[PDB]
Amino acid sequence: MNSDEVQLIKKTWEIPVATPTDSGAAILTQFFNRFPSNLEKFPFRDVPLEELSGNARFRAHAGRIIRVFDESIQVLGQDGDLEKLDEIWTKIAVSHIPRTVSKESYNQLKGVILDVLTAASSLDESQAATWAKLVDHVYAIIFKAIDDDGNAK
Ligand code: HEM
Ligand SMILES: [Cl-]
Ligand SMILES: [Mg+2]
Numbered sequence: 001m002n003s004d005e006v007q008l009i010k011k012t013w014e015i016p017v018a019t020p021t022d023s024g025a026a027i028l029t030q031f032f033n034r035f036p037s038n039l040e041k042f043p044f045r046d047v048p049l050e051e052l053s054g055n056a057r058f059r060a061h062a063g064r065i066i067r068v069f070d071e072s073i074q075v076l077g078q079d080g081d082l083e084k085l086d087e088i089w090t091k092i093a094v095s096h097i098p099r100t101v102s103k104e105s106y107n108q109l110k111g112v113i114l115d116v117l118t119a120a121s122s123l124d125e126s127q128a129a130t131w132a133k134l135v136d137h138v139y140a141i142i143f144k145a146i147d148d149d150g151n152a153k
């Protein structure tokens with residue numbers, strides 16, 4: 001990723017990261033609206049869709065997605081970037097093994113994250129592609145740590 005691309009990610013991230021609560025809720029509500037089976041993994045599985053963002057555990061997970069991306073973006077373009085991303089995302093992958101989060105489930109979330117960011121920062125196609133390169137990189141890291149069903153390899 002060239003220096004222009006890193007800068008673009010950093011600068012466009014400033015908008016959605018300014019509001020972790022709303023931005024994370026946009027991601028996670030969309031995930032559950034499109035792909036409701038994923039609700040069942042959480043303790044808030046029976047909370048009505050319109051009430052999800054009021055649930056504290058929903059808010060915690062929503063905020064985690066934003067914060068982990070923020071941590072990831074912070075390391076870009078500087079020494080140790082690849083190592084630090086591998087660390088971050090390997091740990092995320094292993095953390096979900098006890099919840100059998102499948103590769104399909106991750107891929108469901110992937111498209112929703114990119115959708116939310118594209119809208120939030122008004123990304124053009126080229127800018128969205130730069131974001132997709134980052135996300136695909138981190139997904140490579142996740143996916144070398146799990147089988148298709150989300151178990152350890
Ligand atoms: C960008 C992707 C994601 C990130 C960064 C993320 C991050 C996290 C983190 C940091 C935790 C806390 C782990 C702990 O208890 O120590 C967590 C828990 C959890 N995540 Fe994710 N997650 C992601 C995607 C997903 C997906 C796709 C699902 C699918 C349903 C999911 C389901 C869960 C569940 C069920 C928990 C445990 C909740 C509980 O124990 O009450 N996550 N996630
Ligand atoms: Cl579903
Ligand atoms: Mg297996």
Ligand SMILES: [Mg+2]
Nearest residue numbers: 100149150151
């Ligand atoms: Mg099994």
